[PDB]
Specification:
Shape of chain M: elongated
Number of helices of chain E: 2
Protein name (chain K): 39S ribosomal protein L28, mitochondrial
Radius of gyration of chain E: 16 Å
Chains: A alpha/beta (about 260), B mainly alpha (about 50), C mainly alpha (about 210), D alpha+beta (about 100), E mainly alpha (about 100), F alpha+beta (about 210), G alpha+beta (about 50), H little secondary structure (about 70), I mainly alpha (about 100), J mainly alpha (about 120), K mainly beta (about 110), M mainly beta (about 90)
Bound molecules: nicotinamide-adenine-dinucleotide, zinc ion
Strand content of chain M: 25-35%
Order of helices and strands of chain M: EEHEE
Structural class of chain M: mainly beta
Shape of chain E: elongated
Oligomer: part of a larger assembly
Distance between the termini of chain M: 70 Å
Keywords (chain M): Ribonucleoprotein, Ribosomal protein
Number of strands of chain E: 0
PDB class: ribosome
Number of helices of chain M: 1
GO cellular component, one term (chain M): ribonucleoprotein complex
Family (chain M): Belongs to the bacterial ribosomal protein bL33 family.
Largest interface: C-J, 38 and 36 residues
Radius of gyration of chain M: 18 Å
RNA sequence: ACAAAGAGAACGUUUAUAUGUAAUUGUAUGUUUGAUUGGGGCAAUACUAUAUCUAUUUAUAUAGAAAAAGAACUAUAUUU
């Protein structure tokens, strides 16, 4: 990892004065010391890389608004922001200007760039059909837009319109309810579904680039699938195929006159 | 251990389902009074024991 | 060479001659579908011969059955079935779990219907759902079970409900595992579904590899 | 590990939202190529969950405050009824489900 | 321990301990003696919550007493005499989670 | 000889035996409590001193749990009356190696403490710091610079009650600890995991488009 | 003080037989529980007409 | 009768998993020790893995040289 | 007439180079010669000696005698362990069953 | 459960049973095991009500109580007695059902050829 | 025990009651070291199910001195090296010199 | 020598007439159990005629 | 027991044990078959630098196929005995 | 006991790797007298070892090794 040149020794005076095998050589507590110390000294030389684990993942398309991909995301964070969209939406693009002239234009781009960072990449990781991508345009475009596509090839625009008084910490939440609304509305207003039921069940994984720091989830791919495992207590399926008893349907209520009375 | 305790009183008389190997061929006059009084005793000796 | 593990399908043989001998003798009533309660309570078979699972009807030298005879037994032999079925009878092979074996022999201890669990998976493979024995689930299996969930794709045809909103592999390690498997096995049609390449050699996961149909 | 099913009733510390989180059936590490450390600490750890998360930090995501933390107090299900039965019918909509 | 409450023979016979094929509620109440037990099942209660105690806990229903509905064995035994009696079990059934 | 044999421990209820010893604080090993005060008073007496509304409060069955030892199963229903072995297990099982690594605990500093060697702050006043387990015990606590960061320590000082889960679980292996560091890095120092801190790198222009 | 005041090898009559039930055994106080007399076992089981 | 048609036999391209000349081959019971259970790839290796066990029972597969075994 | 048929002697150790038509005499269920039939089946006869009309114990447990133990007038009250519970499939428990 | 001709619930498969009312059966063996079973339920009530008649004055002091502890008698009534009534009822139906058929057979048969040969045809 | 690569958690045994020998002793609460017993008598699966631990205190509890919180001297049955002899030994806990500062009595103790 | 399958000499082994006509796909112990269920039918067809 | 190496009739030579005298003629048709074969003196001595080959009934295929020699110890169908795919001169 | 590791290593424990005649366990043969142990053959279709010699004359099982029909390792070569 570039820090694996641990000196196979350590300053510590060897306990066990006498003699024997295993003396004066590194310990797995000391091997983690030098690993951290010489990790920091790179992290000052800036040569230290964090794409050492994420070597198989296809390196995301670099772009100036697409820094959301190169971030190593905490798996305990992508669990919190569990956003889901209608499955027939193939992609989401969120473009926004670089510098925004009007004061309310800088408001929206803040929301876009926020939603470009906060809510877009969880949707990728959670839904895995959508190809979430964000690009920062370069001009005084005081309004960002969102291109919510769909599997049928159709698509819409979602003019990112936050209110002047609101913050951006909810301006996205509005935009969120402005996208996940459309996604179902587009997916409800689709044409014949037999085709998109094939593409969707053919669309490869779009979220491969996503870099998830599986923190305290490193035991086995069982817990790496912990966001797909979804407990469902009180599950309800009350539609039984009842098979009634046609032959001798009566005759349960007509027998064993218990201990025949005085007449018989 | 398990000794068929659900059979102690579930016999038709008092001398039944009580294992008494101590028998004899001819139980005499007072050995028979001793016997009949015996079966009922360890039938009421058992009960009021188990009731107390 | 003849071991009996926990769950073996080894029946005690009730020769059809015995059952046919009784029905005329008068121990068994030909009207009432002769479930194993009647056989046990009429002293046709004792306690020392009904060990789970119940019995097996064997057409032993019985070249003919004269009257329409109805039976609810466990795993009749194929000839014994085609003998009752010729004389207008029936044979609906009940293959009850052990919990069902009790509540059929001593129902005077179960005042109400205490629900019965379906038999072991090994039994459902061979008797309970197999129409060759007219197992009692050969109606249900084709009617309700053999159909997948109305949302399941190709990979999740066996889950009670498709665990994803899309048939395809969910995450990377479910994918690269299936991207390697489908070319680990030479590219077969269904080889997409990753399978464990180690055979436990258990008797439960054993179903008739060769046999009649 | 785990072999038997059990559902706990975890009480958050931030909102005290008594949410229940179960523990499914996760099969034993393979005995065919046995490994003494991974097994005997799978088992000993299993008594520690089976006794209501004795020596473990509980890490499940809340349902009320949507976030994952480690602040849950594992309620034995007669300390839960002590709590559930003693909440006005409106706060049962607030803290319970 | 100089005195053991029970010899190992009865630390190792779970049949006297577990609830398996063994009734754990002795008294069988009448019709009106149940409609007067369920009167104290409080509103907000649901059988879907009182769980099965583990094996290591004895199977003992001390009967219908104060807060009997939390005794998992008293609850599901009363719930069963309400069947043989015909009383209408309002509360929910054991929801086997999946 | 015993003049005045003491009365049973928790005999305070009028028509039910006192809970077994051990549960009240005494000697374990016996399941069923019994108090000769209760068994001698005839039945009508026990029904005199009590009304029906009360017996339903002391009949009360707290079935698995114990009403007294809060959080532990009632010791008249366990396999044997001793305390639950499983909950109070010794930290080392019968075979494992003692590789319990160095653990750092949270302490509430009580005076603005300022190191003169790193020239920075061990800790501000009234802020909880994760310090070594043998700095705290040996250097921070004996002098009055710090105390532990327990729940009640917060209560005594005037701070919003925070649950650090101080030693809620000890890790018996380094990599079993370096997972616990990842849990505690999330709950305690949460600002590390905001969408704003994962993007200090990018709050403005991607650096390749700025001046020089 | 709650203990019984003799080495329990002398009072082993109580610990192994079916006196394990008829006796208080809390912290080795081998003292008899309450026990009805036979004038009462029938006074309490006839008044019920059992 | 019903004119329904079914073949005479089911041909499965499956291969038998018990070869008479292979040692641990067979169909084992659902609770027998699966093929080479506890062995860990070594001859009688489940013995060598006993010292590795954390704690064993008081009566645990001890010394027993096959004498009149 | 109860043979105790046993498999071939040399069927796993050394195969390469042995005769071509004797590498298969190892495959038949041959009887063991009666001089050993009587030795091994001697430990089974002892079950009730001097009773000239009880047959020897069998090698495998025949299906009717297993129940013969629980077909005794004293076992009629053990619902469990009757009608075959060991050789039954593994019991099924409450989904909450736990130890 | 089976135990009568109604078919156990294992007619989940809708196995019908046609060609019925086909057999006159005198219920010979079943009436035998009824008189045997009716003797048990009465031979059980005799036990459930055994009450001390101590013909001796030594242990006369229980001459009013039942011969079984109240908890046990309260069990044996429910374990063995009330079971034996169900087992008696079962035969009280497997016969009351089979008679219903015979009542129908012995009419449709009496007509055809003879009311004299009839109880010879069914002899 | 199942053989698939990725076994997602589930309510019940997905493929029937878990097969294998060691799954047989876990299905009854025992620990996986029961697989190494030669005799599993009704006392044995009692002995090793840890109903009541075979584990005691070095001195009398009424006369104990060093603060043993919840510990015993549990005996660890070891099986020896190449020739597997079974021997057992009593393993203690690790007592440290607890040199604390109880600020009640403003001094180390 | 050092062969395993000596040519068909006079031995009444499995139905070699049907060992030729059968899919090699199936394993052995599942073939010799299936050339018989083929032959078992060829025996019924012959008896009926 | 000791006595690990026997001493009565230590045979001069011994055909089965010689650097490659017993060879598993595994089938070139990667059906996993093998037919253990001791190289005779015609190949015991290195008359063959080439790895032995023979035509033998492949009992699986029921066809005479090649038998390339190979050490008798080893898995006989490894991921090296996969043949690269090829489109046959048949088909459209 | 020696060494490793873990505890800001305040000292007691637990491990791992090691196995000490300080270690008290068990083996240390059998047959003819000190050598021999195998399967054949010639010596009246006798064979004590008699007398001679030969040689792919083969080392059964159980765990591992080879997973289709095919296969390896070793034991006074009946082999506790
Ligand atoms: N293998 C078995 O478990 C088994 C065997 C024989 C009988 N049973 C039947 O089980 C029934 C009880 O149900 P379960 O098996 O779930 O266990 P259970 O006995 O715990 O059932 C709950 C409770 O129902 C009550 N009850 C049972 N039968 C009753 C009756 N006839 N009238 C009134 N109350 C009654 C008892 O209090 C019992 O404890 C009994 O009626 C019994 O005859 C079960
Ligand atoms: Zn919360």
């Amino acid at each position: 990892e570039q820090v694996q040149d641990v000196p196979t020794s350590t300053d510590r005076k060897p306990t066990g004065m006498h003699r024997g095998p295993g003396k004066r050589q590194t310990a797995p507590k000391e091997a983690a010391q030098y690993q951290f110390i010489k990790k920091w000294d790179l992290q000052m030389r800036e040569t230290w890389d964090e794409l050492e684990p994420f070597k198989g993942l296809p390196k995301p398309k670099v772009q100036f608004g697409n820094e959301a991909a190169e971030v190593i995301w905490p798996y305990a964070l992508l669990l919190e922001n569990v956003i889901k969209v209608h499955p027939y939406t193939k992609s989401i693009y969120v473009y926004y200007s670089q510098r925004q002239s009007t004061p309310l234009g800088e408001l929206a781009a803040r929301v876009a760039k926020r939603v470009s960072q906060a809510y877009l990449i969880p949707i990728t990781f959670h839904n895995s059909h959508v190809y979430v991508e964000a690009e920062m345009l370069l001009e005084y475009s005081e309004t960002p837009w969102v291109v919510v596509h769909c599997l049928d090839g159709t698509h819409k625009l979602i003019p990112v319109k936050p209110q002047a008084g609101q913050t951006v910490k909810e301006g996205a939440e509005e935009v969120l309810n402005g996208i996940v609304s459309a996604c179902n509305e587009i997916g409800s207003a689709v044409k014949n579904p037999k085709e998109v039921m094939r593409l969707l069940s053919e669309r490869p994984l779009q979220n491969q680039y996503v870099r998830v720091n599986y923190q305290w989830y490193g035991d086995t791919p069982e817990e790496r699938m912990s966001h797909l495992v979804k407990w469902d207590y009180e599950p309800e399926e009350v539609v039984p195929q009842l098979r009634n008893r046609t032959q001798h349907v009566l005759d349960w209520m007509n027998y064993d006159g218990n201990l025949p009375t005085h007449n018989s | 251990g398990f000794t068929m305790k659900y059979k102690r009183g579930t016999g038709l008389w008092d001398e039944d389902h009580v294992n008494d190997f101590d028998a004899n061929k001819y139980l005499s006059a007072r050995s028979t009074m001793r016997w009949y009084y015996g079966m009922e005793r360890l039938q009421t000796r058992n009960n009021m024991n188990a009731r107390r | 060479p003849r071991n009996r593990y926990e769950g073996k399908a080894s029946f005690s043989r009730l020769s059809l001659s015995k059952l046919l001998w009784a029905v005329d003798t008068g121990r068994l009533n030909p009207n009432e579908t002769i479930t194993l309660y009647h056989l046990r309570n009429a002293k046709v078979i004792a306690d020392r011969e009904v060990v789970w699972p119940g019995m097996v009807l064997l057409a032993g030298n019985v070249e003919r059955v004269p009257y329409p005879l109805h039976i609810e037994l466990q795993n009749a032999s194929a000839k014994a079935i085609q003998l009752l079925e010729e004389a207008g009878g029936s044979f609906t092979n009940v293959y009850m779990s052990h919990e069902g074996l009790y509540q059929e022999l001593h129902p005077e201890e179960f005042p109400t219907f205490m629900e019965q669990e379906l038999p072991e998976r090994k039994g459902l493979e061979n008797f309970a759902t197999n129409s060759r024995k007219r197992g009692w689930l050969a109606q249900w299996y084709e009617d309700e079970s053999r159909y997948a969930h109305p949302g399941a794709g190709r990979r999740t045809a066996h889950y009670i409900r498709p665990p994803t909103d899309r048939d395809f592999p969910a995450t990377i390690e479910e994918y690269e595992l299936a991207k390697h498997h489908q070319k680990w096995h030479l590219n077969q049609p269904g080889s997409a579904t990753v399978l464990p390449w180690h055979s436990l050699n258990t008797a439960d996961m054993a179903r008739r590899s060769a046999g009649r149909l | 590990s785990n072999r038997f099913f059990q559902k706990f009733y975890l009480r958050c510390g931030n909102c005290s939202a008594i949410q229940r989180s179960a523990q499914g059936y996760q099969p034993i590490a393979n005995p065919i190529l046995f490994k003494s450390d991974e097994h005997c600490r799978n088992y000993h750890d299993e008594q520690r969950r089976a006794a209501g998360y004795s020596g473990m930090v509980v890490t499940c995501r809340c349902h009320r405050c949507e976030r994952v933390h480690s602040n849950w107090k594992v309620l034995d299900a007669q300390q839960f009824l002590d709590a559930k039965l003693r909440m006005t019918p409106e706060e049962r909509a607030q803290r319970l489900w | 321990s100089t005195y053991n409450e029970k010899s190992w023979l009865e630390k190792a016979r779970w049949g006297a301990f577990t609830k398996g094929s063994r009734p754990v509620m002795r008294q069988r109440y009448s019709a009106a003696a149940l409609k007067e037990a369920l009167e104290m099942v409080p509103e907000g209660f649901e059988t879907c919550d009182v769980p099965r105690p583990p094996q290591r806990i004895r199977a003992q229903s001390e009967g219908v007493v104060g807060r009997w509905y939390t005794n998992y064995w008293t609850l599901h035994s009363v719930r069963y005499q309400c069947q043989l009696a015909g009383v209408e079990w309002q509360f929910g059934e054991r929801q086997r989670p999946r | 000889v015993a003049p005045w044999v003491p009365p049973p421990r928790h005999d305070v209820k009028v028509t039910m035996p006192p809970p077994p010893g051990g549960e009240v604080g005494g000697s374990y090993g016996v399941s069923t409590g019994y108090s000769d005060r209760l068994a001698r008073t005839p039945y009508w007496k026990r029904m005199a001193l009590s009304t029906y509304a009360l017996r339903m409060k002391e009949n009360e069955t707290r079935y698995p749990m114990s009403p007294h030892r809060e959080g532990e199963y009632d010791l008249r229903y366990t396999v044997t009356a001793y305390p639950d072995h499983i909950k109070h297990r010794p930290l080392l099982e019968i075979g494992e190696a003692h590789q319990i690594p160095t653990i750092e605990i949270p302490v509430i500093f009580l005076v603005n403490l300022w190191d003169e060697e790193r020239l920075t702050w061990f800790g501000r006043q009234y802020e909880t710091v994760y310090v070594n387990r043998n700095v705290a015990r040996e250097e921070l606590l004996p002098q009055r610079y710090a105390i532990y960061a327990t729940e009640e320590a917060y209560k005594l000082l005037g701070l919003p009650v925070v649950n650090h889960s101080i030693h809620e679980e000890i890790p018996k292996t380094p990599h079993a600890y370096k997972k616990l560091l990842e849990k505690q890095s999330y709950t305690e120092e949460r600002w590390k995991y905001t969408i704003e801190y994962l993007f200090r790198k990018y709050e403005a222009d991607p650096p390749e488009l700025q001046d020089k | 003080a709650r203990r019984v005041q003799c080495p329990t090898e002398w009072v082993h009559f109580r610990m192994h037989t079916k006196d394990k039930l008829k006796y208080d055994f809390q912290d080795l106080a081998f003292r008899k529980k309450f026990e009805y007399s036979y004038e009462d076992v029938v006074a309490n089981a006839k008044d019920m007409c059992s | 009768a019903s004119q329904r048609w079914l073949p005479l036999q089911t041909l499965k391209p499956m291969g038998h998993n018990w070869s008479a000349a292979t040692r641990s081959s067979g169909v084992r019971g659902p609770h027998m020790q699966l093929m080479q259970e506890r062995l860990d790839q070594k001859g009688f290796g489940w013995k060598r893995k006993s010292r590795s066990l954390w704690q064993q029972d008081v009566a645990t597969a001890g010394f027993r040289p096959h004498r009149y075994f | 007439s109860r043979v105790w048929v046993a498999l071939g002697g040399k069927m796993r150790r050394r195969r390469i180079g042995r005769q071509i038509d004797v590498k298969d005499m190892r495959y038949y269920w041959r009887p063991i010669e009666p001089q050993y039939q009587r030795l091994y089946m001697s430990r089974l006869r002892i079950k009730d000696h001097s009773n000239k009309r009880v047959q020897p114990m069998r090698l495998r447990a025949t299906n009717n005698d297993i129940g013969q133990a629980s077909s005794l007038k004293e076992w009629e009250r053990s619902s469990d362990r009757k009608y075959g519970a060991a050789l039954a499939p593994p019991k099924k428990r409450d989904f909450e069953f736990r130890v | 459960s089976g135990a009568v001709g109604r078919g156990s619930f294992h007619s989940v498969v809708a196995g019908a049973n046609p060609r019925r009312i086909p057999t006159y059966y005198n219920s010979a063996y079943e009436l035998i095991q009824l008189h045997r079973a009716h003797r048990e339920v009465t031979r059980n009530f005799l036990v459930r009500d055994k009450v001390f008649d101590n013909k001796f004055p030594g242990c006369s002091l229980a001459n009013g109580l039942f011969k079984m502890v109240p908890n046990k008698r309260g069990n044996f009534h429910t374990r063995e007695l009330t079971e034996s009534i169900r087992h008696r009822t079962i035969w009280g139906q497997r016969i009351q059902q089979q008679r219903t058929i015979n009542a129908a057979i012995l009419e449709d048969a009496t007509k055809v050829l003879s009311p004299a040969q009839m109880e010879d045809r069914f002899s | 025990f199942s053989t698939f690569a990725l076994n997602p958690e589930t309510s019940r045994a997905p493929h029937g009651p878990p097969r294998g020998l060691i799954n047989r002793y876990i299905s009854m609460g025992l620990p996986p070291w029961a697989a190494w017993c030669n005799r599993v008598n009704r006392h044995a699966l009692y002995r090793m199910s840890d109903v009541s631990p075979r584990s005691f205190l070095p001195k009398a509890p009424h006369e104990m001195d060093v603060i043993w919180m919840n510990e015993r001297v549990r005996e660890r049955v070891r099986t020896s090296r190449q020739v597997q002899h079974v021997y057992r030994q009593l393993k203690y806990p690790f007592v440290k010199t607890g040199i604390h500062y109880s600020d009640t009595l403003d001094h180390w103790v | 020598h050092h062969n395993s399958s000596l040519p068909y000499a006079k031995h009444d082994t499995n139905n070699v007439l049907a060992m030729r006509l059968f899919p090699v796909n199936v394993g052995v112990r599942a073939r010799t159990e299936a050339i018989r269920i083929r032959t078992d039918d060829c025996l019924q067809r012959l008896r009926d005629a | 027991r000791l006595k690990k190496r026997m001493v009565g009739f230590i045979p001069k030579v011994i055909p089965r044990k010689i650097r490659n005298n017993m060879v598993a003629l595994r089938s070139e048709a990667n059906t996993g078959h093998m037919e253990g074969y001791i190289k005779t003196e015609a190949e015991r001595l290195d008359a063959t630098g080439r790895k032995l080959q023979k035509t033998m009934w492949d009992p699986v295929l029921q066809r005479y196929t090649l038998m390339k020699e190979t050490k008798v110890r080893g898995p006989f169908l490894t991921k090296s005995n996969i043949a690269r795919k090829v489109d046959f001169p048949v088909g459209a």
